[PDB]
Amino acid sequence: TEAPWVTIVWDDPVNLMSYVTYVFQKLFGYSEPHATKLMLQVHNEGKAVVSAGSRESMEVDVSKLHAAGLWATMQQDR
Numbered sequence: 168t169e170a171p172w173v174t175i176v177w178d179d180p181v182n183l184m185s186y187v188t189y190v191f192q193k194l195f196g197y198s199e200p201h202a203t204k205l206m207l208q209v210h211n212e213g214k215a216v217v218s219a220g221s222r223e224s225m226e227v228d229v230s231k232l233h234a235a236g237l238w239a240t241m242q243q244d245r
């Protein structure tokens with residue numbers, strides 16, 4: 168069966184919170200309040216879904232995030 172996927176960013180001990188907010192705006196076109204909210208969700212919960220779409224589209228988002236130095240994975244949405 169067909170299924171959509173999500174990209175998840177994970178908290179890490181090195182990166183700056185301000186960097187993550189910028190990366191989400193730059194890579195995804197998100198507004199500042201959206202990017203900051205997602206950043207704080209990852210930082211306070213340990214992880215958060217940052218984007219959603221086809222498996223192929225999430226593969227691109229994971230690669231973009233890895234090149235930025237962020238810990239990203241993808242998984243099917245259930």
Ligand SMILES: [Mg+2]
Pocket residue numbers: 176177178179182236237238239
């Ligand atoms: Mg990270």
Ligand SMILES: [Mg+2]
Pocket residue numbers: 244245
């Ligand atoms: Mg879900």
Ligand code: NI
Pocket residue numbers: 179180210
């Ligand atoms: Ni921290």
